[PDB]
Design an enzyme around this catalytic site. Structure first.
Site, PDB file in Angstrom:
ATOM      1  N   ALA A  32       0.591  -1.352  -0.133  1.00 31.42           N
ATOM      2  CA  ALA A  32       0.078  -0.256  -0.127  1.00 31.42           C
ATOM      3  C   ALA A  32       0.752   1.191   0.045  1.00 31.42           C
ATOM      4  CB  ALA A  32      -0.946  -0.224   0.876  1.00 31.42           C
ATOM      5  N   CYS A  33       1.560   1.107   0.466  1.00 32.99           N
ATOM      6  CA  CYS A  33       2.803   2.012   0.818  1.00 32.99           C
ATOM      7  C   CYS A  33       3.710   2.699   0.067  1.00 32.99           C
ATOM      8  CB  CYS A  33       4.117   2.197   2.094  1.00 32.99           C
ATOM      9  SG  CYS A  33       4.780   3.382   1.964  1.00 32.99           S
TER      10      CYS A  33
END
Ligand SMILES: N[C@@H](CCC(=O)N[C@@H](CS)C(=O)NCC(=O)O)C(=O)O
Lengths: 298, 314
Positions: A32-33
């Protein structure tokens, strides 16, 4: 919003505490990051898999921070095979029990010294570009995301892309007053207008070839329509319908290069932001749209 | 008063939003408590509200502007509900010229001090008796369509948004457009679990697909003429890109980029008919939803996009 700077800043180098060796280093990430995803893209592009392991956390960041899959099972999330950590914070706390910053990813770990080498994505990808060149097969060794003659232009774009775009979207999304929101979102879209014209005839931002500047931009742009538009109110217009050059550029990278595609997990991306940021989205609901996550090539 | 007042509310425990019916349901009839007269009735609205906007559109279409006055509330709907401009100044918002109300709730509590429902706009008010005639947009637009006909000039009297031959179809279309679109966006937006959100947003977009097909080749939903079906639809669609996409998570696709027929149908009404354009206040629209629904949007931030609020005709 102000981003607290990263505190583990060591480099992998022939002549130091952290020398380039097979099976010594390990990268802790979330799909996600976008910061962590920089390091995944470059890791694949430079073919560093045999030197550098990867553990993917759960995208659901609760009150204890990023969980490992044994705390929070989620498709494509891993348990920590090394330190048996339950959350990313354990890694930090193990090596610095008095650490006062954020428990962020990516974390570049040394399996030999049991410490954190570096937790700053811009440095990880820089070292990934050269530190192992002597141990890599030819094509992988030759790849240069930071080539000497372009380093000036790269540094330049990197700085303002970082400020107004990479961090811009978060400044827009985390702003808690109308005025701070507008103060962030306008430069974001101004900078996009700029990148958009920069790419008018090009497949890459700088110098006619793939550079770390494309990598740093991509991670934000690929998250823009599926997340930033709604979640962070960055919505003057969208990539797919607002920025033809950025849209073409991003899609070429995504569809044409497994390093950009295989490291891109949209379920983790959408789940992480929408579910975790309750101060923006109280009921943790994940919008279905837009459909699709990313459009096919033209 | 806070519980039935401050929109910081409560859904069903399965997460779904169940709209409460309006409870003032009287009609303007030739000899009733409420007879048709010029200068007797007044309309309390917000420009933000699609339901209330229905009444504003029909009011202009039917030439009723000289007959029925309008008071526009502030869009910033706080813990006391909709405020009048003297409580909360906002451009194009009004103070109450009739009952010196602070908030819309004062209108309701004056006529029924034990009122337990929500203090909604629109309110069709009777100046002679000082009560609420009707607070259901669907019925207000019906009565506006016919009840003043004997009082209007020929051109306005003859306009019929609900003609005999088209009534059954209008009713059929209105029914599922209301359920899955008009109130569908709210069911999507206000849902408090993932499941409930999906159960509402999917049929919403199925109905847009259906609407998109009906409008192939067509300038109007039904019978090749303007009917109340268009008006009821338009108030949701015109709010879709500027609000519903982000605020209500109705983002499968947008109108401007995902629905060419709806996009065309809407721009034509808006640009080509002053009743649709002159009653559409985008600042009120966006401020209301984003600033007011803190259970969706805690910091009350109003997104700058999308730009523009509505695209020019081609
Ligand atoms: N059934 C009514 C619905 C009107 C309505 O709920 N309007 C909203 C604006 S979106 C309102 O005044 N909300 C105030 C509240 O619910 O507290 C109609 O169609 O007229």
């Amino acid at each position: 919003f102000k981003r607290k700077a990263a505190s583990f800043r060591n480099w992998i180098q022939p002549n130091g505490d952290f020398t380039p060796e097979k099976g010594r280093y390990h990268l802790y990430v979330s799909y996600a990051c976008p910061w962590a995803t920089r390091t995944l893209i470059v890791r694949k592009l430079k073919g560093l898999e045999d030197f550098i392991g990867v553990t993917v956390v759960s995208p659901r960041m609760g009150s204890n921070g990023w969980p490992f899959a044994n705390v929070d099972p989620f498709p494509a999330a891993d348990s920590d095979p090394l330190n048996n950590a339950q959350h990313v914070k354990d890694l930090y706390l193990k090596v610095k029990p008095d650490y006062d910053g954020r428990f962020t990813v990516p974390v570049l770990w040394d399996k030999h010294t049991g410490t954190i080498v570096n937790n700053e994505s811009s440095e990880i990808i820089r070292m990934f570009n050269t530190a192992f060149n002597h141990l890599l097969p030819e094509d992988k060794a030759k790849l240069d995301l930071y080539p000497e003659s372009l380093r000036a232009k790269i540094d330049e774009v990197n700085d303002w892309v970082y400020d107004t775009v990479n961090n811009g979207v978060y400044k827009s999304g985390f702003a808690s007053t109308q005025k701070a929101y507008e103060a962030a979102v306008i430069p974001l879209f101004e900078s996009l207008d700029r990148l958009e014209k920069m790419l008018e005839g090009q497949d890459y931002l700088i110098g006619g070839q793939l550079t770390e500047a494309d990598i740093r931009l991509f991670v934000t742009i690929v998250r823009f329509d599926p997340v930033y538009v709604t979640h962070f109110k960055c919505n003057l217009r969208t990539i797919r319908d607002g920025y033809p050059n950025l849209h073409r550029w991003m899609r070429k990278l995504y569809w044409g290069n497994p390093a950009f595609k295989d490291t891109c997990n949209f379920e983790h991306i959408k789940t992480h932001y929408f579910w975790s940021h309750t101060f923006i989205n109280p009921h943790r609901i994940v919008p279905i749209g837009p459909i699709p996550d990313i459009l096919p090539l033209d």
